[PDB]
Amino acid sequence: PKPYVAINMAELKNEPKTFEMFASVGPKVCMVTARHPGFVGFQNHIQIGILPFGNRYGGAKMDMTKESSTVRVLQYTFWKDWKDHEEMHRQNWSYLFRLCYSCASQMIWGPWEPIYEIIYANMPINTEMTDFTAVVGKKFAEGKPLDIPVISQPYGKRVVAFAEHSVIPGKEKQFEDAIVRTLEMLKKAPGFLGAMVLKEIGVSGIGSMQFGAKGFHQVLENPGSLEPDPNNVMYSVPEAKNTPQQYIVHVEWANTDALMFGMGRVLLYPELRQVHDEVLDTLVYGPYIRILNPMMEGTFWREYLNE
């Protein structure tokens, strides 16, 4: 079935010390998160660039890593119930906070952790190029050759278009109907590896280190080994849900060329352009498209999705 998604967002200095901490601390946080039985996996991204839309964002390009002074991370964790995410944080607060806080020296902004429900998903399991022979054989043995997925390679061997949208109040249903129609046609593009639509349902105060006064002081004064009071979070997840309603349209691609022209299909193919125009008419903000590299992931989240 469809899990809920927590996306931890932060911006850090673009320097080797940051990427060393990704390799040291990242796996630990993931291991702590996996203590909860509602955890069904994760997909962690670094932003490598921005889709320029021709020259609409003419200072951007799809790979800005060599030039950029910062790196933005977007860490998806998937949950059977979004309340599992909140329980996990509280049950493991002593490990989690101390781990996360060790990133402090590299932080420029964040963490900010909105929660989403998945309202549409066409996402395959990941496979390495070594796996497809056995996948094909199993599917033909089962009499289901239609179930043979594209090869979506894990661990940094594909790219993600992360398309931010916020919708005019009262237009959410028109947006949702038109974006599904759009993605159902978009899957014809070469190198298309899957898509899903995330609809924000709120924000995790504890995952965003957003406390009341007491916890705020505990964070600012912290030597690194004392927890802020997790009961000092002043708001529930739904209380922080944004209006205008926010969505993420998450589309995966074989490479940045397939991304650029594949996403471009909603502008260049007249039939799809007419359908996607109904999306555009609903927007307060967007589409703003970040280019992401899914480097570290627990691919079994897609096994849960498609069961």
Which partner in a second copy, Fe ion, none is near 27 (CB below 5 to 8 A by kind)?
A: a second copy
* Residue 81 interaction partner, one of Fe ion, a second copy, none, beta carbon < 5-8 Å per kind: none
Task: Copy the structure tokens of residue 248.
Answer: 């993420």
CA atoms within 13 A on the CB side of 45: 24
Is 207 among the residues that bind Fe ion (CB under 5 A)?
A: yes
Contact 70, 14 (CB under 8 A): yes
Closest CA to 237 of 263, 210, 216, 269: 210
Other Cβ atoms less than 10 A from the Cβ of 134: the count is 10
CA-based nearest residue to 244, from 178, 167, 164 = 167
Please give the structure tokens belonging to residue 164. Answer: 């931010």
- 41 contributes a contact to Fe ion by CB under 5 A: no
- Specify the long-range contacts of residues 272-277, CB closer than 8 Å, at least 24 apart: 272/182, 272/185, 272/186, 275/178, 275/181, 275/182, 275/185, 276/178, 276/182
Over the window 264 to 303, marking each residue x when it contacts a second copy by CB under 8 A and - when it does not, the resulting string is xx-xxxx--x--xxx-xxxxxx--x-------xxxxx--x
Residue 177 interacting entry, from a second copy, Fe ion, none, C-beta within 5 to 8 Å by type = none
Q: Which stretch binds a second copy (CB under 8 A): 1-9, 115-123, 252-260?
A: 252-260
Considering CB under 8 A, how many residues would be counted as binding a second copy? 134
**Residue closer to Fe ion, measured from CB, 6 or 193:** 6
Query: Interface residues for a second copy in 19-78 (CB under 8 A)?
Result: 24-25, 27-28, 30-32, 34-37, 39, 41-42, 50, 52-60, 64, 67-70
To the question of whether residue 113 is assigned a binding role by annotation, the answer is yes
Torsion over CA: 162, 81, 85, 209 (sign): positive
> Which span sits near Fe ion by CB under 5 A: 39-47, 57-65, 141-149, 199-207?
199-207
Tell me: does residue 136 bind a second copy (CB under 8 A).
Answer: yes
**Interface stretch with a second copy, choices 1-9, 18-26, 115-123 (CB under 8 A):** 18-26
Alpha-carbon distance of 295 to 304, in angstroms, equals 20
**By the 8 A CB rule, do 41 and 144 touch?**
no
Q: Is 239 in the site for a second copy (CB under 8 A)?
A: yes
34 interface partner picked from a second copy, Fe ion, none, CB below 5 to 8 A per type:
a second copy
Is residue 210 a contact point for a second copy (CB under 8 A)? yes
Tokens (6 digits) for 251: 């589309």
Q: Are 195 and 252 in contact (CB under 8 A)?
A: yes
Of 220-239, which residues contact Fe ion (CB under 5 A)?
none
Residue 207, binding choice from a second copy, Fe ion, none, Cβ under 5 to 8 Å by partner class: Fe ion
Query: Is position 111 an interface residue for Fe ion (rule: CB under 5 A)?
Result: no
- Considering only 1-9, 115-123, 183-191, which stretch makes contact with a second copy by CB under 8 A? 183-191
Taken as a whole, the chain contains a residue count of: 307
* Cβ contact 4:77 at 8 Å: no
Which of 74/254 has CB closer to Fe ion?
74
Residue 107 or 180 with smaller CB distance to a second copy: 107
> Contact between 244 and a second copy (CB under 8 A)?
yes
Distance, CA of 60 to CA of 37 (rounded, Å): 41
- Peptide bond just before 244 cis, omega within 30 deg: yes
Which residues are annotated as part of the binding site for Fe cation? 85, 89, 113
Binding site for Fe ion (CB under 5 A): 6, 8, 207
